[PDB]
Amino acid sequence: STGSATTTPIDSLDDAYITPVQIGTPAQTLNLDFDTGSSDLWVFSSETTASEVDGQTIYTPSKSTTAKLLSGATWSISYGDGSSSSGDVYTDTVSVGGLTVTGQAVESAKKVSSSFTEDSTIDGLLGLAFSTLNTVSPTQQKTFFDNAKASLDSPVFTADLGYHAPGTYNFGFIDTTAYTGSITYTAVSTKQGFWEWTSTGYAVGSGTFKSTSIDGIADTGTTLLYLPATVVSAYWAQVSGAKSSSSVGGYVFPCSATLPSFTFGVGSARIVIPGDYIDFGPISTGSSSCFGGIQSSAGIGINIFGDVALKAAFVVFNGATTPTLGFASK
Ligand code: NA
């Protein structure tokens, strides 16, 4: 089997991407944030505290003939940005882009933090990291990918995120029409439950490439590119008037600037992030200070190749016995 679904930015900055997911019988379609940095599939639901729902579409298990309470199971998650959610668990039929899993754990939120409530466009998350990070207790649950894997034509999914445009998540096949050149594969460590890999270095604009190992994760649920402070300082030093602002919480730059590209290495290959991809717009409405898309990972304890980096590539998440990542230009 295979599945193919379109993923659409939630706003004009590509802050996140939503993908429609069918849950239950008859189908209830929710728009979920597919997150390769976490391992819970959780949704706004009929159980969510009413004051914490503001425009999201909810899953109602009582209206699904295939829903079953997973008795005694609970979940609670805290993300890198400080947001959180928790609740109980149902199993139900979940379909993505025509690919169906029966008996998927659907984590129903009883509580969500303010950042979730305030985002009316995201109805929940579908985690695509390794199932060792799943938070369901007392019986850990599998991701949608881990449950689908054995049925897929190939044990892979691909992320093809768009810049200010829709993209695609595919399950079970490589679309050889979706990228240019060849896919360069690189080793993955699953020791922390992430798609963790080592970039071979970077360049700023037309500058020389610096060979240096940068360990980090491929995380579709993170908007920005988080790299070591040395690398980030080297990037923003090429932008006149850029500075790190403690008050704003990262590097800002004049909205009048033209940003340089940023290149990252994948083995001997190179992925070029155009400068435009690194502009996240005014810090507040009408400001001439703009927020940068490359930020320091110092204090986060890991480098994160989030959407700013991933949307410059066709990315293969190879879930074979020994997982690997693949990157292609596009
Ligand atoms: Na922000």
mmCIF file of C-alpha atoms and ligand atoms in Angstrom:
data_model
loop_
_atom_site.group_PDB
_atom_site.id
_atom_site.type_symbol
_atom_site.label_atom_id
_atom_site.label_comp_id
_atom_site.label_asym_id
_atom_site.label_seq_id
_atom_site.Cartn_x
_atom_site.Cartn_y
_atom_site.Cartn_z
ATOM 1 C CA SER A 1 0.000 0.000 0.000
ATOM 2 C CA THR A 2 0.874 3.683 -0.286
ATOM 3 C CA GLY A 3 -0.610 7.000 0.767
ATOM 4 C CA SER A 4 -0.152 10.547 -0.538
ATOM 5 C CA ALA A 5 -1.528 13.695 1.147
ATOM 6 C CA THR A 6 -1.058 17.400 0.511
ATOM 7 C CA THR A 7 0.337 19.484 3.363
ATOM 8 C CA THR A 8 -0.565 23.215 3.455
ATOM 9 C CA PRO A 9 1.076 26.067 5.398
ATOM 10 C CA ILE A 10 -1.203 27.415 8.151
ATOM 11 C CA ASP A 11 -0.265 31.074 7.422
ATOM 12 C CA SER A 12 1.781 33.373 5.172
ATOM 13 C CA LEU A 13 5.039 32.657 7.139
ATOM 14 C CA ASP A 14 4.940 28.807 6.903
ATOM 15 C CA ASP A 15 4.756 28.685 10.715
ATOM 16 C CA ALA A 16 3.505 25.096 10.430
ATOM 17 C CA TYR A 17 1.874 22.789 7.930
ATOM 18 C CA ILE A 18 -1.442 20.919 8.212
ATOM 19 C CA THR A 19 -2.416 17.699 6.499
ATOM 20 C CA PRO A 20 -5.964 16.282 6.430
ATOM 21 C CA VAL A 21 -6.386 12.976 8.290
ATOM 22 C CA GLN A 22 -9.526 10.794 8.329
ATOM 23 C CA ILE A 23 -10.367 9.344 11.767
ATOM 24 C CA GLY A 24 -13.225 6.977 12.559
ATOM 25 C CA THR A 25 -16.319 5.604 10.774
ATOM 26 C CA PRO A 26 -17.874 7.539 9.196
ATOM 27 C CA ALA A 27 -14.706 9.584 8.610
ATOM 28 C CA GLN A 28 -14.078 12.666 10.689
ATOM 29 C CA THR A 29 -11.453 14.768 8.871
ATOM 30 C CA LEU A 30 -9.077 16.716 11.102
ATOM 31 C CA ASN A 31 -6.133 18.855 9.989
ATOM 32 C CA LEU A 32 -3.076 17.631 11.828
ATOM 33 C CA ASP A 33 0.492 18.877 12.151
ATOM 34 C CA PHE A 34 2.753 15.987 11.052
ATOM 35 C CA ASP A 35 5.709 16.095 13.442
ATOM 36 C CA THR A 36 8.843 13.986 12.820
ATOM 37 C CA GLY A 37 10.085 15.210 16.220
ATOM 38 C CA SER A 38 7.389 13.509 18.338
ATOM 39 C CA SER A 39 5.537 10.208 18.516
ATOM 40 C CA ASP A 40 1.945 10.913 19.684
ATOM 41 C CA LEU A 41 -1.103 11.206 17.431
ATOM 42 C CA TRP A 42 -3.347 13.451 19.520
ATOM 43 C CA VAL A 43 -6.443 15.455 18.610
ATOM 44 C CA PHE A 44 -8.795 18.071 19.878
ATOM 45 C CA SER A 45 -11.895 16.151 20.854
ATOM 46 C CA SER A 46 -15.366 16.153 22.408
ATOM 47 C CA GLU A 47 -13.456 15.589 25.708
ATOM 48 C CA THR A 48 -11.317 18.770 25.406
ATOM 49 C CA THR A 49 -12.120 21.355 28.146
ATOM 50 C CA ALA A 50 -14.583 23.644 26.331
ATOM 51 C CA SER A 51 -12.706 26.902 27.280
ATOM 52 C CA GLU A 52 -9.541 25.443 25.576
ATOM 53 C CA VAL A 53 -11.252 24.931 22.165
ATOM 54 C CA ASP A 54 -11.396 28.028 19.880
ATOM 55 C CA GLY A 55 -12.312 27.080 16.298
ATOM 56 C CA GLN A 56 -10.528 23.691 15.987
ATOM 57 C CA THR A 57 -12.359 20.730 14.452
ATOM 58 C CA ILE A 58 -12.831 18.044 17.130
ATOM 59 C CA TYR A 59 -12.830 14.258 17.051
ATOM 60 C CA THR A 60 -15.992 12.821 18.686
ATOM 61 C CA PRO A 61 -15.306 9.127 19.441
ATOM 62 C CA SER A 62 -18.960 8.469 20.402
ATOM 63 C CA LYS A 63 -19.903 9.216 16.713
ATOM 64 C CA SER A 64 -17.414 6.630 15.343
ATOM 65 C CA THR A 65 -18.614 3.038 15.082
ATOM 66 C CA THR A 66 -14.971 1.827 15.073
ATOM 67 C CA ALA A 67 -13.761 3.830 18.124
ATOM 68 C CA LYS A 68 -12.925 1.865 21.299
ATOM 69 C CA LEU A 69 -11.672 3.304 24.595
ATOM 70 C CA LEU A 70 -8.171 2.008 25.353
ATOM 71 C CA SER A 71 -9.077 1.341 28.974
ATOM 72 C CA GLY A 72 -6.818 2.864 31.558
ATOM 73 C CA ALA A 73 -4.484 4.542 29.064
ATOM 74 C CA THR A 74 -3.480 8.177 29.511
ATOM 75 C CA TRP A 75 -1.001 10.475 27.833
ATOM 76 C CA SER A 76 0.763 13.731 28.566
ATOM 77 C CA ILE A 77 3.301 15.546 26.421
ATOM 78 C CA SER A 78 5.469 18.666 26.688
ATOM 79 C CA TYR A 79 7.092 20.094 23.544
ATOM 80 C CA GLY A 80 10.360 22.046 23.017
ATOM 81 C CA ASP A 81 8.378 25.342 22.696
ATOM 82 C CA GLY A 82 6.828 24.922 26.214
ATOM 83 C CA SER A 83 3.379 23.807 24.932
ATOM 84 C CA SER A 84 1.634 20.725 26.298
ATOM 85 C CA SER A 85 -1.442 18.541 26.126
ATOM 86 C CA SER A 86 -2.824 15.463 27.857
ATOM 87 C CA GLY A 87 -5.814 13.141 27.926
ATOM 88 C CA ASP A 88 -7.070 9.611 27.383
ATOM 89 C CA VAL A 89 -6.833 7.215 24.429
ATOM 90 C CA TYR A 90 -9.095 5.522 21.858
ATOM 91 C CA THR A 91 -8.189 3.122 19.135
ATOM 92 C CA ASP A 92 -9.833 3.861 15.751
ATOM 93 C CA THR A 93 -9.308 3.645 12.002
ATOM 94 C CA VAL A 94 -6.979 6.391 10.725
ATOM 95 C CA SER A 95 -6.367 7.153 7.034
ATOM 96 C CA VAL A 96 -3.799 9.505 5.497
ATOM 97 C CA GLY A 97 -3.888 10.141 1.752
ATOM 98 C CA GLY A 98 -5.641 6.797 1.083
ATOM 99 C CA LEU A 99 -3.422 4.689 3.418
ATOM 100 C CA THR A 100 -5.507 3.149 6.244
ATOM 101 C CA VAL A 101 -4.418 1.844 9.650
ATOM 102 C CA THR A 102 -6.887 -0.006 11.832
ATOM 103 C CA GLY A 103 -6.462 0.039 15.618
ATOM 104 C CA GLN A 104 -4.393 3.265 15.659
ATOM 105 C CA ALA A 105 -4.070 4.892 19.054
ATOM 106 C CA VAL A 106 -5.836 8.273 18.813
ATOM 107 C CA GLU A 107 -4.935 10.295 21.891
ATOM 108 C CA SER A 108 -7.952 12.450 22.822
ATOM 109 C CA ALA A 109 -7.012 15.733 24.545
ATOM 110 C CA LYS A 110 -8.719 16.619 27.800
ATOM 111 C CA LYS A 111 -6.318 19.566 28.295
ATOM 112 C CA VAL A 112 -4.250 21.671 25.873
ATOM 113 C CA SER A 113 -1.951 24.628 26.597
ATOM 114 C CA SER A 114 -2.758 28.141 25.454
ATOM 115 C CA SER A 115 -0.574 28.006 22.272
ATOM 116 C CA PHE A 116 -2.762 25.108 20.950
ATOM 117 C CA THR A 117 -6.050 26.851 21.841
ATOM 118 C CA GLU A 118 -4.843 30.056 20.130
ATOM 119 C CA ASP A 119 -4.043 28.201 16.856
ATOM 120 C CA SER A 120 -7.495 27.501 15.319
ATOM 121 C CA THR A 121 -5.902 25.922 12.208
ATOM 122 C CA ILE A 122 -4.221 22.897 13.957
ATOM 123 C CA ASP A 123 -6.609 20.171 15.156
ATOM 124 C CA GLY A 124 -3.828 18.031 16.636
ATOM 125 C CA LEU A 125 -0.484 16.399 15.883
ATOM 126 C CA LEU A 126 0.537 13.205 14.125
ATOM 127 C CA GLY A 127 3.913 12.125 15.397
ATOM 128 C CA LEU A 128 6.427 10.453 13.044
ATOM 129 C CA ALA A 129 9.480 10.053 15.315
ATOM 130 C CA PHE A 130 10.283 6.618 16.764
ATOM 131 C CA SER A 131 7.601 4.926 18.873
ATOM 132 C CA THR A 132 10.022 4.804 21.872
ATOM 133 C CA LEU A 133 9.005 8.480 22.493
ATOM 134 C CA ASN A 134 5.246 7.800 22.592
ATOM 135 C CA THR A 135 3.865 9.052 25.944
ATOM 136 C CA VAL A 136 0.910 6.648 26.406
ATOM 137 C CA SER A 137 0.916 4.971 29.835
ATOM 138 C CA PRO A 138 0.909 2.244 30.996
ATOM 139 C CA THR A 139 1.174 0.632 27.525
ATOM 140 C CA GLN A 140 3.242 2.675 25.039
ATOM 141 C CA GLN A 141 1.593 2.955 21.601
ATOM 142 C CA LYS A 142 2.929 2.890 18.036
ATOM 143 C CA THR A 143 2.998 5.765 15.564
ATOM 144 C CA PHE A 144 0.850 5.746 12.442
ATOM 145 C CA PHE A 145 4.043 5.029 10.398
ATOM 146 C CA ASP A 146 5.133 2.167 12.668
ATOM 147 C CA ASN A 147 1.602 0.589 12.396
ATOM 148 C CA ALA A 148 1.498 1.112 8.568
ATOM 149 C CA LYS A 149 5.105 0.024 7.885
ATOM 150 C CA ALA A 150 4.653 -3.687 7.244
ATOM 151 C CA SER A 151 1.760 -2.958 4.762
ATOM 152 C CA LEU A 152 3.660 -0.320 2.765
ATOM 153 C CA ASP A 153 5.292 -1.048 -0.608
ATOM 154 C CA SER A 154 8.594 0.298 0.902
ATOM 155 C CA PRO A 155 9.104 1.166 4.626
ATOM 156 C CA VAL A 156 9.534 4.902 4.002
ATOM 157 C CA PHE A 157 7.751 8.196 4.123
ATOM 158 C CA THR A 158 8.840 11.407 2.457
ATOM 159 C CA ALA A 159 8.408 15.069 3.328
ATOM 160 C CA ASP A 160 8.247 17.566 0.503
ATOM 161 C CA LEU A 161 7.342 20.851 2.197
ATOM 162 C CA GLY A 162 6.620 23.948 0.157
ATOM 163 C CA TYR A 163 7.929 27.500 0.524
ATOM 164 C CA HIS A 164 4.810 29.621 0.869
ATOM 165 C CA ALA A 165 2.990 26.823 -1.014
ATOM 166 C CA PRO A 166 1.487 23.372 -0.445
ATOM 167 C CA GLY A 167 3.680 20.273 -0.438
ATOM 168 C CA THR A 168 3.279 16.550 0.010
ATOM 169 C CA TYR A 169 3.704 13.720 2.516
ATOM 170 C CA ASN A 170 4.009 10.328 0.832
ATOM 171 C CA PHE A 171 3.960 6.941 2.558
ATOM 172 C CA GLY A 172 5.400 3.778 1.061
ATOM 173 C CA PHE A 173 7.096 5.115 -2.082
ATOM 174 C CA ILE A 174 9.616 7.603 -3.475
ATOM 175 C CA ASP A 175 8.218 9.952 -6.082
ATOM 176 C CA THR A 176 11.207 10.170 -8.453
ATOM 177 C CA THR A 177 9.498 13.179 -10.190
ATOM 178 C CA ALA A 178 9.526 15.262 -6.976
ATOM 179 C CA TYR A 179 13.303 16.021 -6.793
ATOM 180 C CA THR A 180 16.304 16.880 -8.951
ATOM 181 C CA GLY A 181 19.574 14.956 -9.112
ATOM 182 C CA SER A 182 20.099 12.081 -6.693
ATOM 183 C CA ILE A 183 19.075 11.378 -3.084
ATOM 184 C CA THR A 184 22.015 11.327 -0.663
ATOM 185 C CA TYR A 185 21.416 9.009 2.285
ATOM 186 C CA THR A 186 23.006 9.517 5.722
ATOM 187 C CA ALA A 187 23.086 7.507 8.929
ATOM 188 C CA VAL A 188 20.505 7.891 11.673
ATOM 189 C CA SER A 189 20.862 7.353 15.417
ATOM 190 C CA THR A 190 17.580 6.321 17.097
ATOM 191 C CA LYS A 191 19.153 6.490 20.612
ATOM 192 C CA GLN A 192 17.102 9.614 21.604
ATOM 193 C CA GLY A 193 13.973 8.507 19.587
ATOM 194 C CA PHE A 194 14.523 11.144 16.880
ATOM 195 C CA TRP A 195 15.593 11.102 13.223
ATOM 196 C CA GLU A 196 19.049 12.188 14.426
ATOM 197 C CA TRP A 197 21.803 12.597 11.864
ATOM 198 C CA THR A 198 25.113 14.447 11.320
ATOM 199 C CA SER A 199 25.475 17.195 8.768
ATOM 200 C CA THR A 200 28.925 17.532 7.225
ATOM 201 C CA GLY A 201 29.098 21.339 7.424
ATOM 202 C CA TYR A 202 27.772 24.605 6.134
ATOM 203 C CA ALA A 203 28.350 27.680 4.016
ATOM 204 C CA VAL A 204 26.912 31.206 4.280
ATOM 205 C CA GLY A 205 25.885 32.754 0.954
ATOM 206 C CA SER A 206 28.616 32.410 -1.668
ATOM 207 C CA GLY A 207 31.205 31.743 1.094
ATOM 208 C CA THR A 208 33.494 28.714 1.345
ATOM 209 C CA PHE A 209 32.044 25.533 2.788
ATOM 210 C CA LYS A 210 33.178 24.779 6.372
ATOM 211 C CA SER A 211 33.590 21.034 6.976
ATOM 212 C CA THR A 212 32.338 20.355 10.503
ATOM 213 C CA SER A 213 30.092 17.681 12.020
ATOM 214 C CA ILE A 214 26.702 19.049 13.240
ATOM 215 C CA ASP A 215 24.542 16.461 14.979
ATOM 216 C CA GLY A 216 20.852 17.297 14.850
ATOM 217 C CA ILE A 217 17.315 16.095 14.224
ATOM 218 C CA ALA A 218 15.089 16.294 11.169
ATOM 219 C CA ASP A 219 11.932 17.812 12.734
ATOM 220 C CA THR A 220 8.946 18.792 10.599
ATOM 221 C CA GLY A 221 7.106 20.061 13.664
ATOM 222 C CA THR A 222 9.720 22.782 14.343
ATOM 223 C CA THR A 223 9.432 25.928 12.227
ATOM 224 C CA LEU A 224 13.011 27.212 12.330
ATOM 225 C CA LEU A 225 16.608 25.981 11.878
ATOM 226 C CA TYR A 226 18.395 25.772 15.283
ATOM 227 C CA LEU A 227 22.213 25.419 15.014
ATOM 228 C CA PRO A 228 25.232 25.974 17.223
ATOM 229 C CA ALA A 229 25.905 29.569 18.266
ATOM 230 C CA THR A 230 29.174 29.674 16.252
ATOM 231 C CA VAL A 231 27.358 28.778 12.997
ATOM 232 C CA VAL A 232 24.433 31.146 13.661
ATOM 233 C CA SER A 233 26.789 34.076 14.501
ATOM 234 C CA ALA A 234 28.662 33.443 11.252
ATOM 235 C CA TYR A 235 25.394 33.592 9.296
ATOM 236 C CA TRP A 236 23.980 36.785 10.855
ATOM 237 C CA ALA A 237 27.381 38.558 10.685
ATOM 238 C CA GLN A 238 26.724 38.691 6.895
ATOM 239 C CA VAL A 239 23.489 40.719 7.397
ATOM 240 C CA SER A 240 24.007 44.433 8.119
ATOM 241 C CA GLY A 241 22.178 45.450 11.257
ATOM 242 C CA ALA A 242 21.360 41.902 12.442
ATOM 243 C CA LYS A 243 21.673 41.267 16.148
ATOM 244 C CA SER A 244 20.654 38.833 18.846
ATOM 245 C CA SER A 245 17.856 40.387 20.933
ATOM 246 C CA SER A 246 17.304 38.954 24.457
ATOM 247 C CA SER A 247 13.978 40.928 24.542
ATOM 248 C CA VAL A 248 12.645 39.353 21.312
ATOM 249 C CA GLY A 249 14.233 35.911 21.973
ATOM 250 C CA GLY A 250 16.650 35.521 19.081
ATOM 251 C CA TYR A 251 18.322 37.071 16.081
ATOM 252 C CA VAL A 252 16.477 39.889 14.350
ATOM 253 C CA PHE A 253 17.404 41.788 11.232
ATOM 254 C CA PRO A 254 16.246 44.894 9.329
ATOM 255 C CA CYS A 255 13.222 44.160 7.224
ATOM 256 C CA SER A 256 15.035 46.114 4.426
ATOM 257 C CA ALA A 257 17.798 43.419 4.227
ATOM 258 C CA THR A 258 18.330 40.882 1.473
ATOM 259 C CA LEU A 259 19.343 37.670 3.301
ATOM 260 C CA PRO A 260 22.091 35.355 2.109
ATOM 261 C CA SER A 261 21.481 31.707 1.478
ATOM 262 C CA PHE A 262 22.571 29.017 3.910
ATOM 263 C CA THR A 263 23.996 25.680 2.696
ATOM 264 C CA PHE A 264 24.149 22.531 4.805
ATOM 265 C CA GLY A 265 26.042 19.340 3.981
ATOM 266 C CA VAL A 266 24.578 15.862 3.622
ATOM 267 C CA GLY A 267 27.615 13.668 3.135
ATOM 268 C CA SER A 268 29.336 15.079 0.020
ATOM 269 C CA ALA A 269 26.067 16.685 -1.150
ATOM 270 C CA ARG A 270 24.815 20.204 -0.397
ATOM 271 C CA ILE A 271 21.294 21.583 0.264
ATOM 272 C CA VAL A 272 20.920 25.289 -0.329
ATOM 273 C CA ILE A 273 18.327 27.214 1.707
ATOM 274 C CA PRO A 274 17.536 30.440 -0.213
ATOM 275 C CA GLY A 275 17.759 33.626 1.785
ATOM 276 C CA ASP A 276 14.055 34.293 1.415
ATOM 277 C CA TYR A 277 13.294 31.078 3.370
ATOM 278 C CA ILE A 278 15.115 32.591 6.429
ATOM 279 C CA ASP A 279 12.774 35.664 6.638
ATOM 280 C CA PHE A 280 10.001 35.218 9.250
ATOM 281 C CA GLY A 281 8.746 38.769 8.931
ATOM 282 C CA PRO A 282 8.140 41.590 11.353
ATOM 283 C CA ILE A 283 8.544 40.777 15.074
ATOM 284 C CA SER A 284 5.212 42.572 15.685
ATOM 285 C CA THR A 285 2.750 43.936 13.277
ATOM 286 C CA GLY A 286 4.184 46.986 11.435
ATOM 287 C CA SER A 287 7.698 46.635 12.863
ATOM 288 C CA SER A 288 10.758 47.144 10.667
ATOM 289 C CA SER A 289 12.618 44.503 12.758
ATOM 290 C CA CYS A 290 12.221 41.011 11.271
ATOM 291 C CA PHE A 291 12.669 37.657 12.949
ATOM 292 C CA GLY A 292 15.341 35.329 11.619
ATOM 293 C CA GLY A 293 14.778 31.762 10.536
ATOM 294 C CA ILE A 294 18.178 30.537 11.693
ATOM 295 C CA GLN A 295 18.509 30.655 15.507
ATOM 296 C CA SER A 296 20.920 29.332 18.144
ATOM 297 C CA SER A 297 20.318 25.919 19.665
ATOM 298 C CA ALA A 298 22.318 26.840 22.756
ATOM 299 C CA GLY A 299 20.175 25.963 25.808
ATOM 300 C CA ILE A 300 17.891 23.655 23.767
ATOM 301 C CA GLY A 301 20.502 20.855 24.093
ATOM 302 C CA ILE A 302 20.047 19.672 20.450
ATOM 303 C CA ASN A 303 20.351 21.103 16.915
ATOM 304 C CA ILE A 304 17.095 21.035 14.982
ATOM 305 C CA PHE A 305 16.771 20.921 11.216
ATOM 306 C CA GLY A 306 13.212 22.259 11.238
ATOM 307 C CA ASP A 307 11.009 23.379 8.346
ATOM 308 C CA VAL A 308 13.352 26.192 7.176
ATOM 309 C CA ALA A 309 15.899 23.531 6.283
ATOM 310 C CA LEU A 310 13.559 20.663 5.314
ATOM 311 C CA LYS A 311 11.469 22.663 2.892
ATOM 312 C CA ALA A 312 14.641 23.307 0.817
ATOM 313 C CA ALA A 313 14.852 19.512 0.197
ATOM 314 C CA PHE A 314 12.990 16.366 -0.702
ATOM 315 C CA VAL A 315 13.471 14.349 2.501
ATOM 316 C CA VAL A 316 13.260 10.529 2.807
ATOM 317 C CA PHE A 317 12.582 9.039 6.206
ATOM 318 C CA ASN A 318 13.743 5.437 5.622
ATOM 319 C CA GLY A 319 12.273 3.185 8.342
ATOM 320 C CA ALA A 320 14.081 0.004 7.238
ATOM 321 C CA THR A 321 15.614 -2.235 9.937
ATOM 322 C CA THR A 322 18.560 0.226 10.024
ATOM 323 C CA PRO A 323 16.862 3.614 9.515
ATOM 324 C CA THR A 324 18.481 6.283 7.330
ATOM 325 C CA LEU A 325 17.632 9.803 6.094
ATOM 326 C CA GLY A 326 17.820 10.881 2.460
ATOM 327 C CA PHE A 327 18.061 14.429 1.112
ATOM 328 C CA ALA A 328 17.663 15.626 -2.486
ATOM 329 C CA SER A 329 17.536 19.100 -3.998
ATOM 330 C CA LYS A 330 14.270 19.983 -5.724
HETATM 331 NA NA NA B 1 7.883 33.495 17.063
#
